[PDB]
A paper describes a structure:
CD59 is an abundant immuno-regulatory receptor that protects human cells from damage during complement activation. The membrane attack complex (MAC) is a human immune pore that ruptures lipid bilayers to kill cells. Though unable to bind soluble C8 or C9, CD59 directly engages both proteins within the nascent MAC to trap C5b8 and C5b9 assembly intermediates.
Unlike the single stoichiometry observed for the C5b8-inhibited complex, our cryoEM analysis reveals that C5b9-CD59 is a heterogenous assembly that varies in the extent of C9 polymerization. Using 3D classification to separate homogeneous populations of particles, we find that CD59 inhibits C5b9 with either 2, 3 or 4 copies of C9. CryoEM map A and model B of C5b9-CD59 complexes comprised of 2 molecules of C9 (C91 and C92). D For the terminal C9 (C92, yellow), only the first transmembrane β-hairpin has unfurled while TMH2 (red) remains helical. Although transmembrane residues of C91 have unfurled into their β-hairpin conformation, CD59 prevents these residues from reaching the lipid bilayer. A comparison with the MAC conformation of C9 shows that CD59 deflects the extending β-hairpins 60° from their transmembrane trajectory. In our structure CD59:E56 forms a salt-bridge with C9:K349, consistent with mutagenesis data showing that a charge reversal at this position (E56R) disrupts CD59 activity.
Residue numbers in the entry:
A (entry chain D): 194 to 200, 214 to 242
B (entry chain C): 349 to 397
C (entry chain B): 22 to 50
D (entry chain C): 200 to 223, 225 to 248
E (entry chain B): 395 to 408, 411 to 443
Write the structure that this text describes.
Amino acid sequence: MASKSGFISSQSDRGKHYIRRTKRFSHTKSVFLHAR
Amino acid sequence: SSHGCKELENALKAASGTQNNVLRGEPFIRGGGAGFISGLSYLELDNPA
Amino acid sequence: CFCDHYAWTQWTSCSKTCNSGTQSRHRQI
Amino acid sequence: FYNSTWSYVKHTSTEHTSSSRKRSFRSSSSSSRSYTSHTNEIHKGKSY
Amino acid sequence: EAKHCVRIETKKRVAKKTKVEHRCTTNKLSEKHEGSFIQGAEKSISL
């Protein structure tokens, strides 16, 4: 977000930044071997 | 003068993978020398014959 | 077409017990 | 034996743009949107 | 590819008032349907 006013003189500014990041990873491996 | 911005991004990259690999087999033999029985009944995966 | 996308129904029960019946199945078109 | 293989891409990109200005004073508003939906699918079945 | 892009303008004077707007909405889509299916069998019988 950004906001401005400008106009004797007056200047006003507001800024905001937000970031959220998520990484989730899962790996599953299974081996069953039987010989008889 | 006045100005204002609002800006947004949202991204979702889901993914998945799976693999099932199954192998089975049963040679069976009657008759013949026990050495040749064991030597043949052992399953060679590259030549099941 | 990749016809496996329109998977087969399972085989209809064998038309007769003996002397060569037939079993058949449509796709899920 | 049989070897089924399937490879499916769906790509969509959608864009919106709306610029407006009014004067008598001055005012203006710009909006922009970009959307994407993507799916990649691979499926395989091998039987012996 | 599909496009709808439009530009409007207007001035009116009596005092003056004006409006001008531009919109351009667009879509692009692609699909690729690659596939393969190989099958086979072998009987052998010997006597």
